[PDB]
Each structure stands twice: as structure tokens, then as C-alpha cells.
Structure 1
Amino acid sequence: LRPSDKFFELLGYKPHHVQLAIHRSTAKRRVACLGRQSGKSEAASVEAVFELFARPGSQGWIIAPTYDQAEIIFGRVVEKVERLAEVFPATEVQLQRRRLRLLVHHYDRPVNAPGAKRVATSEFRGKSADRPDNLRGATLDFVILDEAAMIPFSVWSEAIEPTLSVRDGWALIISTPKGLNWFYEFFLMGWRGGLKEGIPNSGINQTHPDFESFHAASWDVWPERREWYMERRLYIPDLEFRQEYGAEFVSH
């Protein structure tokens, strides 16, 4: 249910402390409010790869505000899945790049052997919030929301959450913050790190047991870049800096 160090090693993946914390969490609602360059995309892609191989027949989506944004995590899952399939002889990968559809077929024997029968198919799709029409179906075991704070809450409440609750699927909800909107609320439901600047009501907030939240500024992950980030404030508006790098929740 959780990818292991052995699985990371297969992926050529060496997570950072914040990525590792996300991977170790068993919460069905993981909410990561992290600045740019925090490793959000890579960690989410690793989660998807693991599900497709470790849970044959699993179905998941990555949803972003736009298709170009969804292509980022989707494309990384593709590379990893097509490479990793080499060491699982009973799998065969099928890709539809145009439709952002990735299939991992699981067989009853190695694919190169006579008589191989397909037993299960894991499926991973990219989806766009700015195309609600293509949000139909589907029984999901997992979902990734990328730049979630820019996705309308209605996409979550109406088009994603109902299908997840069916199979008791999990959600990884990741974003740089965009003020005090639904992403802030979901973040607080899982925030147990106490009072922290940039997070209103931290320290006094309630939490829900199925929620776990993660927070990191860009310079928490890249301390050697802290001075460069700070020196950009000469030409970057203060709000943009506090949100995109500080990962701060600010009342617009």
C-alpha cells in the first residue's frame, strides 16, 4: 500500500524529506502546500507508478487546471511505467498520448510466453479542470490534483470525491497556495505542525483523521537557494513571492 525503498530504488528515485513524508503517509487525503521546486510532480508520479503495478486493475487520474499542466505528471508517469515494465515480465504497457491514457496490462504469465492471458488492466489518465465535459465516470482508486488551489472546488466536490468514496480511494492534493479557498480548508484539516507564519489558524485548528497535510517553502527543500529566492523580491510582487516560494496562505 506504500511504495518501499526497494521500489524507489527500482525507479531510480531518491526522495527528499518532504517527498518521503508524503510517501510514508497512509492518509486517504494527503494535502501538500509546497512552493515551486519542492518535488511535488515527481512524488505524485511515483505514487501513480506504484499503484499501477502494485495494485493490478487500479484506476487513477491526475487532474490539473489545464491539459498542458496535466501532461507534466502524466508524462513522467509514462516514462517511469514504460521503463519499470521491463522488470515485470507479466506486464505490457499501452499508451495513447493524444488521449492522455496509459494502460498497464497484467497477464497470468510472462508476456513473451505462449498462451499469455490478460488478467487485469491498470489505467491512468490525465484530465483538465478547464474541460469539465471530459470529466465523466469513473470508479477511481486514486487521484492526484495538481495545482489544486487553481481548480474550482466544484470539480472536487461533484466530479472527483463521489467516485473516490466508492472504492475508498485516496487523493493526493498538491498545490502552491492561492489564498483562503477550498485548498486552504483541506490543508488545515490535516495540519498538525502547530502554529506557523503564513498559515492562518494554524496551532488552533481542528483536524480530521483521514487528512494529513505537508508544508514547505521552496527554500525548505532548497536551503542553498534561499538567498536567491529572497533577492528576487526586488522584481517579484510580495504576494507572488510569499505564495509561490513561501507557500503562504494570504488573504487576497
Structure 2
Amino acid sequence: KRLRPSDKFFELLGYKPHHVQLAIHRSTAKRRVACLGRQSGKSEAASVEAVFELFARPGSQGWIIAPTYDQAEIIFGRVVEKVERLAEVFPATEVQLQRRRLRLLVHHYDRPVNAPGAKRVATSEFRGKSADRPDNLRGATLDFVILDEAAMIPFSVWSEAIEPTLSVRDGWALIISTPKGLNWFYEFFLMGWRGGLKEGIPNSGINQTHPDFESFHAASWDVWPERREWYMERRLYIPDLEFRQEYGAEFVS
């Protein structure tokens, strides 16, 4: 089996996923590739996936990798907030923060941590990592990785550093980004794209797929149709190709 977050888990986080987020979260594919527009909730979904593992699979170890250390810092902070809030309603957990290392542990016990005879059962681990510091990415064995703004991460970093961390455990990867042309993120996206011909996806509908891959595509106004006009105003003062790529989530060049 492959464990995925329940409606109840989302509620306990005060998290109401959009339909696209819902689709990403329920997928059991070992390689999930999500091509989404700016401000659609990519980083949010990433943080939620990390929290689920820490609490729902005691002992799990994984990373979110972002392109730059500053982004990794930010998203590490966002995961910390969610973990600390959820630890409130889980008496049998104890959180250990190592902020200067962008490292976080969640210790699981066999009973409320406050109670007599509490046995530590498992320790979950999460870290924020950055593609601009590839020396930090070696030596690890992990259950999951999440690549945030993956299309800005060099392919070599995925192939040489990140993917090998998943081998022993047959761990999963979530690869999420606003697109940046026809680079490796585009190639990986196509491997999981079964949605047929779609505007903004070159050669969609005639692409070959792999069973371990599942792909998701939505422009910022498709994930968040409520505020379609807010996104569309940017159309009038942002160049066409840039608007189409950054909010449309189109693969351009």
C-alpha cells in the first residue's frame, strides 16, 4: 500500500486544498510532476506533503529541495509552523528544532509524552536543502524528496545527488514547478501526462508515458478560479510569453 493524506489530516492542519492540490496529494505515483502557475499553492502543497510524512509515517525521512538557500529557509519555516501547530493535537509527539541546520525532528512516543513510562517509538526527520549548495546534498538515504521550483534546479542535481537518495527505500519524489521551457522538468512532466492534447504543452497527446509517473497541469486561474481576473490583469503589462509561462504554466522554450 501507499499511504496518502486523509480529509481529516487536511482539516487538522486548517488546510483546504484546491482541486488540483487534492489531485496531487491523492496520487500514489512514485514520481509526481506538477506544472502549476505562480501563486497557485506549489510551496503550500510541498509543505503539507512534508508534514504528512513526519506525523503519519513515524520514522520517515525526507527533504524539500529548492533552487536557492533563501527559498529553502522560507519553506523550512513554513513547514515548522505547520508541524508546531499539529504537535498541539498530538500529545504523543515531541518536536526538536535545529533551525541553523534547516533540520527538524518529530519524536513519536507510545503514549502522551507527559505521561509515566513513555517510550520513544520513532523519530521522523525533515530538512530544507538548496540546489545552489550541492555539497550539502550527498550521503543521504531518504524515504521522500520534494523539489520546489524544480524547473530552476539543474538536471545534474536531480540525477547525481537527489535521485540516488531514494534507491534503497524505493522512495517517492514530488517534482513541482512553474515551467522554464523545454528542459528536464518538461521531459519528466511528459512522462506522466495522460491528459491528452492541451494548449501550452508541446506534443501533448502523442507523448510516451511511464507507469511510475503521474503529471498535473494547471494555470494559476485554473487552480484558483475565484480570482481569475486578478491573474488576468497582469496580461496587460507583462509580455505574452512571460505571462503564459508564469501564470499560464505553459511550456514555452
TM-score (norm 2): 0.95
What do residues 99-130 of structure 1 show as CA deviations (whole Å, max 9, x unaligned)?
A: 10010011232211233232211000000000
CA distance in 2, matches of 1:70, 1:246: 25
With 78-87 and 120-129 compared, the bigger mean Cα shift is at: 78-87
Task: Indicate conservation of the 8 Å contact 2:25/2:49, yes or no.
Answer: yes
CA distance in 2, matches of 1:168, 1:4: 23
CA distance in 2, matches of 1:229, 1:21: 22
> Which of the residues 32, 35, 38 maps onto 2:40?
38
Task: Indicate conservation of the 8 Å contact 2:32/2:175, yes or no.
Answer: yes
CA distance in 1, matches of 2:247, 2:199: 14
CA distance in 1, matches of 2:104, 2:81: 11
CA distance in 1, matches of 2:94, 2:225: 41
Aligned-pair distance for 1:72? 3.0
Residue 173 of structure 1 aligns to a residue whose secondary structure is: strand
Change in Cα spacing, 1:85 to 1:229, as seen in structure 2 (3 Å) is closer
What do residues 155-185 of structure 1 show as CA deviations (whole Å, max 9, x unaligned)?
A: 1001111111220111110000000000000
Task: Indicate conservation of the 8 Å contact 1:41/1:72, yes or no.
Answer: no
CA distance in 2, matches of 1:228, 1:93: 39
- Residue in structure 2 matched with residue 14 of structure 1 by the alignment: 16
Change in Cα spacing, 1:196 to 1:115, as seen in structure 2 (3 Å) is same
What do residues 2-30 of structure 1 show as CA deviations (whole Å, max 9, x unaligned)?
A: 11001111111111100000011110101
With 82-91 and 180-189 compared, the bigger mean Cα shift is at: 82-91
Task: Indicate conservation of the 8 Å contact 2:193/2:216, yes or no.
Answer: yes
Query: Any gaps of 5 or more consecutive residues in structure 1?
Result: none
Task: Indicate conservation of the 8 Å contact 2:110/2:118, yes or no.
Answer: yes
Residue 124 of structure 1 aligns to a residue whose secondary structure is: strand
Residue 98 of structure 1 aligns to a residue whose secondary structure is: helix
> Which of the residues 143, 146, 149 maps onto 2:145?
143
Task: Indicate conservation of the 8 Å contact 1:217/1:245, yes or no.
Answer: yes
Query: Any gaps of 5 or more consecutive residues in structure 2?
Result: none
Change in Cα spacing, 1:119 to 1:238, as seen in structure 2 (3 Å) is same
- Residue in structure 2 matched with residue 76 of structure 1 by the alignment: 78
Aligned-pair distance for 1:60? 0.4
With 218-227 and 39-48 compared, the bigger mean Cα shift is at: 218-227
Task: Indicate conservation of the 8 Å contact 1:49/1:80, yes or no.
Answer: yes
What do residues 194-251 of structure 1 show as CA deviations (whole Å, max 9, x unaligned)?
A: 0011101100011101100000001112334333433323321222211110101012
Change in Cα spacing, 1:238 to 1:89, as seen in structure 2 (3 Å) is same
What do residues 123-157 of structure 1 show as CA deviations (whole Å, max 9, x unaligned)?
A: 00000000111112211111110000000001100
CA distance in 1, matches of 2:193, 2:167: 22
Identity of aligned residues (%): 100
Residue 26 of structure 1 aligns to a residue whose secondary structure is: coil
TM-score (norm 1): 0.96
CA distance in 2, matches of 1:65, 1:143: 14
Task: Indicate conservation of the 8 Å contact 1:33/1:214, yes or no.
Answer: yes
With 103-112 and 57-66 compared, the bigger mean Cα shift is at: 103-112
> Which of the residues 170, 181, 184 maps onto 1:182?
184
Task: Indicate conservation of the 8 Å contact 1:34/1:176, yes or no.
Answer: yes
With 241-250 and 108-117 compared, the bigger mean Cα shift is at: 108-117
Task: Indicate conservation of the 8 Å contact 2:18/2:224, yes or no.
Answer: no
Residue 230 of structure 2 aligns to a residue whose secondary structure is: helix
With 218-227 and 53-62 compared, the bigger mean Cα shift is at: 218-227
